[PDB]
C-alpha cells in the first residue's frame, strides 16, 4: 500500500547484472523480451518495490 518508486535516468543500463543480485527464476516481460533489453533503449525507467 506504500510501494516505493525510484527514478532511473542519465545512465548506462546493463540488464545482464540483474541475475546476480537476486535469486529469481526468470523475467516476466510484457511488450519486450528480457534478452533483447540491451540492443534498444528507453527514455525513463522506474522501479517499484513491494
Amino acid at each position: 500500500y506504500a510501494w516505493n518508486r525510484k527514478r532511473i535516468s542519465n545512465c548506462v543500463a546493463d540488464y545482464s547484472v540483474i541475475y546476480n543480485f537476486a535469486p529469481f527464476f526468470a523475467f516476466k516481460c510484457y511488450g519486450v523480451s528480457p534478452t533483447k533489453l540491451n540492443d534498444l533503449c528507453f527514455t525513463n525507467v522506474y522501479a517499484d518495490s513491494f
Binding site: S16, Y19, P23, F24, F25, A26, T35
Partner: peptide
C-alpha cells in the same frame, strides 16, 4: 545454474 535454464531453448541468447 537456475537462472540459465531458460537459455536452453531455440532462439534464446545470453551467456550459456
Amino acid at each position: 545454474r537456475g537462472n540459465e535454464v531458460s537459455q536452453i531453448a531455440p532462439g534464446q541468447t545470453g551467456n550459456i
